Design a protein around this ligand. Sequence first.
Ligand SMILES: NC(=O)c1ccc[n+]([C@@H]2O[C@H](COP(=O)([O-])OP(=O)(O)OC[C@H]3O[C@@H](n4cnc5c(N)ncnc54)[C@H](O)[C@@H]3O)[C@@H](O)[C@H]2O)c1
Lengths: 326, 327
Amino acid sequence: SEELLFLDRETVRACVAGVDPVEVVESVLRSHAAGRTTLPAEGYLPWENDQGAYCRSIAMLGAVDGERGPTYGIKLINAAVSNPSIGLDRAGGCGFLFDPRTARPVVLAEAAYLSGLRTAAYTMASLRHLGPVGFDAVSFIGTGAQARVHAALLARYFPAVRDLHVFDTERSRAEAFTGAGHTVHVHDTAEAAVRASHVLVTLTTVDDGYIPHDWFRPGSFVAHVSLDDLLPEVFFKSEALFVDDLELIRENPRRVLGALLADGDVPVTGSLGGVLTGAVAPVRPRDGVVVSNPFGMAVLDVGLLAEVAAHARSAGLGTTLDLLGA
Amino acid sequence: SEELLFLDRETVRACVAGVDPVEVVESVLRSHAAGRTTLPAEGYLPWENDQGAYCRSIAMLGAVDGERGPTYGIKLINAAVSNPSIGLDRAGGCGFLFDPRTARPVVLAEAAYLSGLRTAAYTMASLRHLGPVGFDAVSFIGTGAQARVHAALLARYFPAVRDLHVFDTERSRAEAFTGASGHTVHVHDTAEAAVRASHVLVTLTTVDDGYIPHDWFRPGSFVAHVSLDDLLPEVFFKSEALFVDDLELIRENPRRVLGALLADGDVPVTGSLGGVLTGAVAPVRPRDGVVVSNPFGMAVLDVGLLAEVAAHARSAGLGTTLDLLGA
Ligand SMILES: NC(=O)c1ccc[n+]([C@@H]2O[C@H](COP(=O)([O-])OP(=O)(O)OC[C@H]3O[C@@H](n4cnc5c(N)ncnc54)[C@H](O)[C@@H]3O)[C@@H](O)[C@H]2O)c1
């Protein structure tokens, strides 16, 4: 017999709520730092749809020789730039886990939600080890899906956070944002949002940089999720600069940090992985801004899908698909 | 909502019986010869299970801007060496098609049988244009999953084939092999005896080292080199003709003998089967020597067939609808 455990988005939600996604991110980062992950070359299939818009499929294979035991899988994310014009999320797709003995795909999960959850989980990990201690306010620029999942994980992992300071170039999206026990303060300008707290998360789809060093308080932190908001000078004047994977960043020079690396020396303190193993000393904000620039590692999604499937099995959630069908 | 049409193995089987898979392959090969496909580098994740057996996942993307509109998809095929030991087929996996407009996966299928079907359909195309005319016997080295699907298509496309000459290292597998109802199976005791018994060979093993010399082949012989490492280098060099699926694909995989030989120096490559179908190269049928067919395997053929199978399943009302969100 040949069976798939199919986990829909709502099942994956319920599994995430029942595990510690931040603990999982920390465990995979420590495995990655010790050379116990395999990240092969990605499958990339670009094309142009009937509209004339950029479409792609990205196939991201991943293995984690983890503390618990070995995990193997794939993250398949497809995107069309024209999707939001017709009322769809830009990206969608699916993840599989493989049986370590047979190599068979045994788990199939909707992946777009889990992808956003992983990004948010990494932010919480970064804040725990590199952020100010006891911060009670977080600032967002961009207030869509990614802001909602960030707010949810703030309630789980940072209960001192009572106030969210938000700005969105789409005013109506900002005024609709509620959070997850949070009071929301709408700001008229990005600057006013940044100045209102010690912790910024950028969640835009911007190509052009606009955030200077001067906006940040002494003793500040920025999670650079959207990757093109910060001006070159923020990186060079940073009290510290932490990445997820320096090679991933160098391989994507279309994002500002990758571009700066190509121009010469950039003061990268180290990786979040290296902090967690004790390879690099942690630097928390004191006199300046600490910058976190993660590109996003597929091994984290594979690791999170492994923990989600383990919870799904133990609580008997999901639906088993017969691949043969007699 | 975000919905998947799901096609299990036996549904794929049912659809294939009602379309022309060799015609689909031929169309996609002409689309690819014209440069109206996209065949990215295949993703590769290797590892070693606790038994110390070689394991792998292969993610193979493909696009076809062909004679049935633009089609996009992927084929995920995973294998463990140790699977036949514990009583499982060597290879298993799944395939997707993506919406041309939104890029969303809209079809999910079991793929190991589809993969076998595509391979056998390429063999049938190669024999039709490059094989002897009127052959009534075919030889197989290896009687696994590929051998069963090859037998089924021989019944559809070359009904004058009444005799199958087989050899397998596990004689128990060779004794269990029946082919289709129109076939008499002759079991031979060595590889050599199977080869010499006819003018048409299909190698369907898992070897990584060559063992077949030129001397075994009758004058006016054909070989479909599906297992890709059976033929010794001299077979290529002495060949009456040599046809490939895609030369650059082969060049980039020197793990397989023809890739190794091309890196080393000159090899007398006649052209591609795609080239024959478009008229870019002349066909050469066997006469005095052995015509060699060496296809590495192209994901665009899987994507092409899965689109034809999905279209048929809709009009037939087969397959089940899955919801990816769940509400
Ligand atoms: N060209 C392509 O596109 C393509 C695609 C799929 C399959 N293949 C290749 O074909 C093979 C898969 O065949 P399958 O799926 O039927 O595999 P399988 O494991 O089901 O069967 C292989 C059979 O070969 C036999 N065998 C192995 N070594 C042998 C030897 N030296 N002599 C004789 N018999 C031998 C085994 O006993 C077994 O019955 C692999 O090499 C696979 O990669 C090629």
